[PDB]
Amino acid sequence: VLDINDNEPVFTQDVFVGSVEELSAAHTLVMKINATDADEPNTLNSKISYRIVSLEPAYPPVFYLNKDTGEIYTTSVTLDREEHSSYTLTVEARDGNGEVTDKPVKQAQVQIRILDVNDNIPVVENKVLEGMVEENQVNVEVTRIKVFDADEIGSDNWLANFTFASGNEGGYFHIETDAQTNEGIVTLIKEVDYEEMKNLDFSVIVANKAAFHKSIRSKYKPTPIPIKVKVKNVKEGI
């Protein structure tokens, strides 16, 4: 019985899913799509040619689809999660010589999720940096240090983290990160006397809960951020 090309190549799945890390080296294998052709093996009737129909956000191209193997690799163009987090991609499988024609052939979709790495340094937005406390107070909010981070919200790559550089050797302040607003919450843990006129100014260093990516270290110089604190006087009597 002589063969004829009477059935098209069909994908093993209507949707494929893979993941690749940000800043991946060129030609890094992301995933692989597959299809099958029931016609006579090792004949053009069964030679599949995998092609990319459309892509999102289309430009620029960071994925190359080996038409013979179906393997997807990363290009010489670097992936940046902060530029594009997820790629959704429509593929195609063709019969014969793999020539693109006006014929409607079977197509599936691919969804690549780009993995986030800590490659963005935190930054204080807090435009007015000055603490405020009253005399003879304890356990009060001195200030809230609002910090922005480009990396994946919620992750340890985004979560702000703090350390006193200088000024808290007296143990008058405690700092902790509010994971919901990403604010550094500093509070008084000691009463202060306005008349003694102690200088409670202090400096702090910002970073991420998780270490910074090797791509950005050394480019990051820990610069202490100064915070002045003003004290309120109160009528105390004799």
């Binding site: 620029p60 080996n66 010489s76 670097t78």
Partner: protein, 191 residues
């Protein structure tokens, strides 16, 4: 004296940068000169395809060139980015043995395909890209010598990586990619 091994001084397209590409899309200039126990190298890449010549429309770019050589120092073109062998500045009986131009396997051995090990096999430096508007951008260069075998037919490895990590893309249009000359030196194998 049998002391210069190169691509020629102004080669035609001889190298493939883009993936899955079957024909050359770039011109690699590579010169390896013996000097005592070291080789002095000189390398520059020029784009020769629209893909290569629009890479600098992005602010984060990576260009990889890989050279794999056999036991007598000749290029293995199937796996290498460079599709034409290097030649001596003076002509051939048997073409010739270029083993004395290769990176020493004592100084730069082949090792376990374990990640992030043996950073003594790399040379790091910088060269530049002069944009069409004139802005000069630094390109970080990594040269890897030996270290990782790509297959069972290779004796020596030399790979080049040029990286751009700019705040703003150099170009907004196609422009001839040209990496400014990068010089480097390495400990050479015996002749």
């Amino acid at each position: 004296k049998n002391n210069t091994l190169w691509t020629g001084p102004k080669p035609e397209a001889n190298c493939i940068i883009e993936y899955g590409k079957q024909n050359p899309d770039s011109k690699l200039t590579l010169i390896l000169v013996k000097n005592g126990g070291i080789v002095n190298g000189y390398v520059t890449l020029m784009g020769a395809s629209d893909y290569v010549n629009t890479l600098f429309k992005n602010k984060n770019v990576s260009i990889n060139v890989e050279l794999y050589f056999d036991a007598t120092g000749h290029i293995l073109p199937d796996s290498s980015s460079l599709k034409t062998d290097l030649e001596l500045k003076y002509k051939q009986t048997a073409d010739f043995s270029a083993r004395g131009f290769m990176p020493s396997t004592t100084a730069y051995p082949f090792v376990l395909p374990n990640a992030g090990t043996h950073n003594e096999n790399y040379i790091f430096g910088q060269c530049y890209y002069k944009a069409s508007d004139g802005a000069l951008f630094p390109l970080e260069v990594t040269v890897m010598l030996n270290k990782r075998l790509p297959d069972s037919r290779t004796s020596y490895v030399m790979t080049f990586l040029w990286s751009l990590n700019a705040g703003l893309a150099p170009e907004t249009t196609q422009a001839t990619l040209i990496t400014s000359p990068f010089t480097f030196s390495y400990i050479r194998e015996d002749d």
